[PDB]
Amino acid sequence: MESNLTTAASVIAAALAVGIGSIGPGLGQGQAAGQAVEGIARQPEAEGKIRGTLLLSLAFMEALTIYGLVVALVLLFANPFV
Amino acid sequence: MESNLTTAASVIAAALAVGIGSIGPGLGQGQAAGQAVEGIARQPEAEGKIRGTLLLSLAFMEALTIYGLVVALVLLFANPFV
Amino acid sequence: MESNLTTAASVIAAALAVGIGSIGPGLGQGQAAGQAVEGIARQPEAEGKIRGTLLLSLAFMEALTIYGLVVALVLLFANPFV
Amino acid sequence: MESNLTTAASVIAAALAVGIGSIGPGLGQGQAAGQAVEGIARQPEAEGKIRGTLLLSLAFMEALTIYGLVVALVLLFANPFV
Amino acid sequence: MESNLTTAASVIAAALAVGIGSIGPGLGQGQAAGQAVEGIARQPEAEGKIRGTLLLSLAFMEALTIYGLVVALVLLFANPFV
Amino acid sequence: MESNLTTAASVIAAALAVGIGSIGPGLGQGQAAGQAVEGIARQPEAEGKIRGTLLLSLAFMEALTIYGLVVALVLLFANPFV
Amino acid sequence: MESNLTTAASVIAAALAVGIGSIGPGLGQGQAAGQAVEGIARQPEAEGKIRGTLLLSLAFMEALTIYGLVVALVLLFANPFV
Amino acid sequence: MESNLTTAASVIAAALAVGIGSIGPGLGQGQAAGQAVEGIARQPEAEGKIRGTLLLSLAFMEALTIYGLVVALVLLFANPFV
Amino acid sequence: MESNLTTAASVIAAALAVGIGSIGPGLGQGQAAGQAVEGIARQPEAEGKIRGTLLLSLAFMEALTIYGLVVALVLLFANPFV
Amino acid sequence: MESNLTTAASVIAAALAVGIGSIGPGLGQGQAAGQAVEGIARQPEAEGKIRGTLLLSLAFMEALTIYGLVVALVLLFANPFV
Amino acid sequence: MESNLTTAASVIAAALAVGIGSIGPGLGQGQAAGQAVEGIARQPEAEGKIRGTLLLSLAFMEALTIYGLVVALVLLFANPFV
């Protein structure tokens, strides 16, 4: 067991990296997906192209939150200090 | 049984990870699902394609919050410090 | 029976988990449901398709706040520390 | 009878759980219901279908705040610590 | 006459439960009632339908704040601690 | 005369219950009333129906702020602690 | 003649009750009155009906702020504690 | 002549009462006045009806900030405590 | 000459009264005036009627900030305490 | 050279009066001038009218910030306390 | 050299007067200028009138920030206290 300023800061930090880090990407994925299904309603023949482009986009955005995830995980499972 | 700065920080961190972590994805899911059912009303024949793309989208967004859940669960059931 | 920093933090944390965890999902659910009933007004024949997709959607959003609920419940009934 | 940091925290937490927990669902219920009554005016024949889907939606949103309520209730009537 | 941390926290908690707990429902009620009244102007013949769906909706929203009011009332007239 | 943490917290609490508690309902009543008079301009023959529905709505919203009022008044005229 | 925590809190509480208490209702009154004069321009024959409904609305909104006034006046002229 | 916590709080309170008390009403007055002059451009013949209703409105909004002014004035010229 | 907590508070209060007190009225005056000059362009024959109604409006909004000014002036030139 | 709580509060107060006091009027002036210039483009013949009403409006708004400037200048060159 | 509460407050105050004081006027100048060039695109023959009116407007808005500037400069080059 260990408790000090740095272990305390690490668990808070871990929460903030993934917590805050999902805000922009979460909204952004919704905006993109929303336009995707709207576009499919408009032009069902473009479904494949639309899906392909969305998927790509979803990946970029999800990688943003994943950066927060790796920081969180480094802090919890590979902490350099504590 | 155990109380210090780091246990106190862990329980707060746990709540913040899942609480904050649900904000962007919750809004994003509503936006996407909203455009999806609008699109279905507009072009009921496209419902399978729209549902497929939405479902894909919903999963990517839910995953953002699940990262938060994971951090919360590690802090609660596999805490590295306390 | 027991009071320290960690019991105090735990009860605050439990409330922030569910309380904050309902903001994005509640707003999202409203956005999606509203587009659903609007969609039904526009095309009452698509009512079954619209309803099925809405329901799917509402479940994904409900799960986001449930993650908060779960963290709140372990904190209250299976606290790892106090 | 008893006052310490946890009883004080428990009462504030209970309030935060239900108070904050009503913000998203309250806005969302209004957005849905306004769209529902707009739909009815637009297509009074779909009223039953609209009302049915709205009811389903409202219950989902109400459940979100109910999660807050139960945390508040546990804190006040089944408090694990104090 | 007793004053301690918990009695002070309790009166504050009481105000926060009902004060904050009215923001979402109050806004939501406005939105819904506004759409309803506009709907009546558009289609006076659907007034009974519109008015019924509104009433149902208002009640769901008022319940959200009432949960706050229950917490306030427990904290004031059935306080578990003080 | 009496001054302690709890009398101080009570007068602040009283102010916050009615102060904050008027924000949502005040905006909401404006939104609803605004659509009402707009609807009357559009369809002056629906004036009675519109007024009836508004009035009902205004009552629900005003009851939300009134909950804050009763808490304030319990705190000032029927305080359980001080 | 008299200064302590509770007198200081009372004077602040008084200002906050009326100051905050005017925000939602002030905005709401502007919104409603604005739609009212727009409606009059649109249908000058409906001016009596529009004025009647507005006046009713203005009263309900003013009452929200008056609750704030009342709390302020009790704190200043009928203080229960100091 | 006299300085303590309560004189200090009283002057701050007086300023917050009028200062904050002008935000909602000032914005509201602008919204209503702007719709009024727009209305007059659309239907100059309704100018008298529009003006009368505006004036009524402006008075209700002005009264909201006046409540703030009144609390400020008693605090300055009829302080109950200091 | 004199410095204590109340002189310090008085100067800050005076600034807050006029500074905060200009925000709503400043925005509102702009909203009204922009609508006024838009109306004039639309119907230059109504200019006198528009200008007249605008003037009335502007004075009402200016009075709101003037209430702040007078509190500031009392605090600086007729201070009851210091 | 004197430094005390009040001299420090005074220089800060001075900045807040004119700094905060420019937000509403600055935004408002922009809104009004933008509408004016757009109006001129729409109806170049009404330029004299539009320009006169604008000038009048600008002066009312600049006065709001000037009140802030008066407070600043008193606090700096005619300080009542220090 | 001199360092005390008041020199420290003066340099911060100076920054806040011009820093905050550019926010409203900066936005407002953009809004106005934007409508000006839009109006010129619409009616290039009105270019002279539009420019004349913009210029006037820009001056009023720029004077608002200049008030913050003179306070800053009084504080740095003509400080009444330090």
Place this chain on the structure above:
Amino acid sequence: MESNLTTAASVIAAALAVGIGSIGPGLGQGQAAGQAVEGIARQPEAEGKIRGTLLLSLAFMEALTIYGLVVALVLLFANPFV
């Protein structure tokens, strides 16, 4: 194992770099991808062009957050101080 002010500041810093650093890019990516997918629906033939411009854009935005990630990674695996 070392804990000091700097190790604590470093883990927090790491979370802030990637957490905050994802807000703008995440929102921006959503906006861009949404427009792209809508564009494809409008003109399926331009899909290759649209998709290429999007990909280029996504990369510029992901780099913004990656800068945050670099700072986080230095702070964690190549800390200059601790």
Place this chain on the structure above:
Amino acid sequence: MESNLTTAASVIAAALAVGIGSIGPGLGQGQAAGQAVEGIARQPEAEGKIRGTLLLSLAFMEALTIYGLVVALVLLFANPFV
């Protein structure tokens, strides 16, 4: 070589003056330049007039931030106190 409250305040003040001071003018410049290039697309013949007016506007806005720069530079290179 020199450290005290006022040197620390000066360096912070310097950053805040230019940092905050760029917010309104940066947004305003984007708004104006945006309408300018839209206007050019709309009426390419007006490009000289639009460019002239924009350039004038850009200068006035840049000047707002430069006031911030000036305060920062005085604090850094001509500090009156330290």
Place this chain on the structure above:
Amino acid sequence: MESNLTTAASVIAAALAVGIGSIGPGLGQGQAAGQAVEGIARQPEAEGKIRGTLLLSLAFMEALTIYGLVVALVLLFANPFV
């Protein structure tokens, strides 16, 4: 190796520089790129011209965040103080 107030500050500063520094540019890059791909769909023949102008824009915005990056880098690799 070394921990003091400046090393702690340096690491937080580095994070704030790149984290905050990505917010505006990230939003702006998204706004530009979305408009770019919308333009391409509208006029696929202009793609090269659109892509060229977008590239120029993206580099300008990226440079803004790069300024943050370099401050962060100096703080971490060329720190003048620690």
Place this chain on the structure above:
Amino acid sequence: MESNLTTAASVIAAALAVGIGSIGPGLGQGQAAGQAVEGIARQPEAEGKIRGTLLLSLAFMEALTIYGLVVALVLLFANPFV
């Protein structure tokens, strides 16, 4: 080598200067660039005029953040105090 309040403040200040200094300009650049590429889609023949005006614009906005950069650089490489 050296740590005190002023080195600490200086590094924080340097980061706030560039970090905050990029928000308005980054958003502004996005607004202008987006209107530019939209303009090019509408009128590809005006591409050169549009690009030239955009470029001019981007430079004015870039300079705003550069002022921040400059304050950051003197603070780091030509600190007047430490």
